[PDB]
Amino acid sequence: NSNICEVCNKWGRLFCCDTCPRSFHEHCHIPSVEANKNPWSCIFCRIKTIQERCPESQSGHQESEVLMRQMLPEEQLKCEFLLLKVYCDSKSCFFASEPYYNREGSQGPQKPMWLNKVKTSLNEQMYTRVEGFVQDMRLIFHNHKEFYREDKFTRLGIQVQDIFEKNFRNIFAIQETS
Ligand SMILES: [Zn+2]
Ligand SMILES: [Zn+2]
Ligand SMILES: [Zn+2]
């Protein structure tokens, strides 16, 4: 197995996947690495299994249909994986914890949002449809763009949103378009 965490790329107390060579810190994996279970399969492996069991799940889908799906076990897992893919980017550090807003010439957002809040919301089964998760994720980046206005720091929001959107289209097999 790898000797660094797949998500944060650091060594430490790592849990090893039994079906692929990835490793994880306990709370870097989403969901948090399960207490017992030998063998243990990571989320990359679990997602791969879903695909392999239902190859047709990779045919193109309309975003509007994906968003109305109820958060049954497979959709819950797919949102956890998508969240994890965003944490895999080092730029996620800017969006992880609760923000605060005190900049001359801007006003903070009406509804602040951050990754760790989305992570807690998923853990607590607070989303009933995929739309709830996706709306909160997109709101993270929208709030950032609006607050930072013309500061070049706005680009971090564009960058991490692009990671989000690419992974959303991949995980939920959104129909490719120009
Ligand atoms: Zn880690
Ligand atoms: Zn694995
Ligand atoms: Zn099938």
Side-chain angles (χ1 to χ4, degrees), residues 1-36 38-178:
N1 288 63
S2 182
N3 315 326
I4 57 169
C5 177
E6 187 78 355
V7 181
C8 75
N9 303 105
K10 299 285 197 289
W11 180 72
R13 182 49 195 116
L14 299 173
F15 301 85
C16 290
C17 182
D18 291 311
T19 49
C20 75
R22 299 174 170 95
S23 313
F24 308 80
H25 296 104
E26 171 163 16
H27 302 301
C28 281
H29 196 271
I30 304 174
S32 293
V33 169
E34 297 73 11
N36 206 289
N38 322 53
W40 178 74
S41 271
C42 80
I43 190 162
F44 293 75
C45 285
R46 295 168 67 187
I47 289 288
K48 185 200 301 302
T49 297
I50 306 313
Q51 288 169 14
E52 289 178 349
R53 290 176 154 162
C54 282
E56 68 273 27
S57 74
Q58 307 161 276
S59 295
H61 300 81
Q62 299 296 114
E63 180 175 307
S64 60
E65 178 267 323
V66 167
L67 296 178
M68 297 303 314
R69 298 179 189 165
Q70 297 177 11
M71 288 282 254
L72 296 179
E74 287 190 0
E75 302 316 305
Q76 176 74 33
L77 195 71
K78 288 177 158 208
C79 294
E80 290 165 345
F81 188 48
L82 172 51
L83 183 55
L84 177 139
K85 288 294 196 141
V86 168
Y87 281 106
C88 288
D89 198 283
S90 67
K91 294 160 180 285
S92 73
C93 71
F94 297 109
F95 301 105
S97 70
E98 185 173 3
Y100 62 86
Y101 295 97
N102 196 357
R103 184 195 184 235
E104 184 180 336
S106 290
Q107 269 294 329
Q110 303 296 312
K111 187 182 172 180
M113 193 50 62
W114 57 101
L115 301 169
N116 295 347
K117 186 178 169 55
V118 181
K119 181 180 282 204
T120 294
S121 297
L122 274 173
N123 176 244
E124 289 177 15
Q125 302 162 299
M126 300 284 299
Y127 299 110
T128 61
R129 288 172 198 272
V130 171
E131 185 175 49
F133 167 82
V134 173
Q135 283 175 344
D136 277 355
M137 294 292 287
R138 290 173 165 165
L139 180 64
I140 299 171
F141 313 116
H142 193 258
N143 282 351
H144 176 96
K145 285 161 76 180
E146 295 305 298
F147 181 73
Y148 290 105
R149 306 284 201 101
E150 311 309 282
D151 193 297
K152 61 186 170 174
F153 190 62
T154 59
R155 182 158 171 268
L156 273 293
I158 293 164
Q159 293 175 321
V160 181
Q161 180 150 22
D162 193 47
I163 295 301
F164 175 71
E165 297 295 342
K166 291 181 189 266
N167 281 279
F168 175 65
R169 286 188 310 266
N170 180 262
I171 294 167
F172 290 90
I174 297 291
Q175 177 56 51
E176 290 273 292
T177 60
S178 56

